[PDB]
Amino acid sequence: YALMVSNYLNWMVRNLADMEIQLGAVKRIHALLKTEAESYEGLLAPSLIPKNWPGKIQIQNLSVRYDSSLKPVLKHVNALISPGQKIGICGRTGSGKSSFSLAFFRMVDMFEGRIIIDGIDIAKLPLHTLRSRLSIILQDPVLFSGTIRFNLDPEKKCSDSTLWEALEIAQLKLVVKALPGGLDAIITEGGENFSQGQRQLFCLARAFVRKTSIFIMDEATASIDMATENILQKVVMTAFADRTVVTIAHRVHTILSADLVMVLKRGAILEFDKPETLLSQKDSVFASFVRA
């Protein structure tokens, strides 16, 4: 045993050093486990929520942040939106107009204000129910690996025949029917087998599949060429007629046809009226946006 002690000592010390090096990994795992979690329960009673959900949206003294210790990107935002009408949001880059779209999904700190949608505040509502009944499209098209069934309706809540017309709206049915897999064509990582505009049109049909009236179009036209942008916009307007379209757009020429245009400067609503009367004024900032 005394002969074996000399081996056992260095075995113990080397394995102890390796053990502490490897326990650093589980320390990092628990440190990432200590990240705070958003509440998904919802203060509103699940049975009190109606079976179907939206297009009217009421905004009362909204002001949102990203952190508690941060300057508010929006300051005392207050606006009423009629059901079914089309809203074109514009503002200078750096005025925090992008957070206005995220305010409807409770992804920003609503430290004051209240978003009343069809008589129901979103803050009381669960996050899953809120984010399951609102449509939204961002700058870049994020396509996930799998079939067009998985990209368009991953939960398989809608039938395939319901998916066919949804794909028809995006004008990609020629490509998808021409694809070797039929509708079972495999999208690669990020949709590298499609062009950029094609991926964005995929995202549009993906948003149509949920079939809600509130359709938020957060600067989808910015990354897409104008020729595809025009046919995309007209098929959006036809596909979402009864649907309420709140369009956050970086360029005002797209939202020239909206019912109302909101102009944001440093988190404040300068102008809330129709584009015709707004463009009538020479000193209006939206007129400067259109001219420049």
UniProtKB/TrEMBL annotation:
Binding site for ATP 3: 195, 197
Chain sites annotated for binding ADP 2: 66, 94-99
Location within or outside the cell: Cell membrane
Domain ABC transporter, first and last residues per copy: 57-291
Coiled coil location: none
Subunit and interaction comment: Forms an heterooctamer with KCNJ11; four ABCC8/SUR1 molecules interact with one KCNJ11 homotetramer.
Annotated function: Regulator subunit of pancreatic ATP-sensitive potassium channel (KATP), playing a major role in the regulation of insulin release. In pancreatic cells, it forms KATP channels with KCNJ11; KCNJ11 forms the channel pore while ABCC8 is required for activation and regulation.
Entry's family note: Belongs to the ABC transporter superfamily. ABCC family. Conjugate transporter (TC 3.A.1.208) subfamily.
Protein name listed in UniProt: ATP-binding cassette sub-family C member 8
Source organism: Mesocricetus auratus
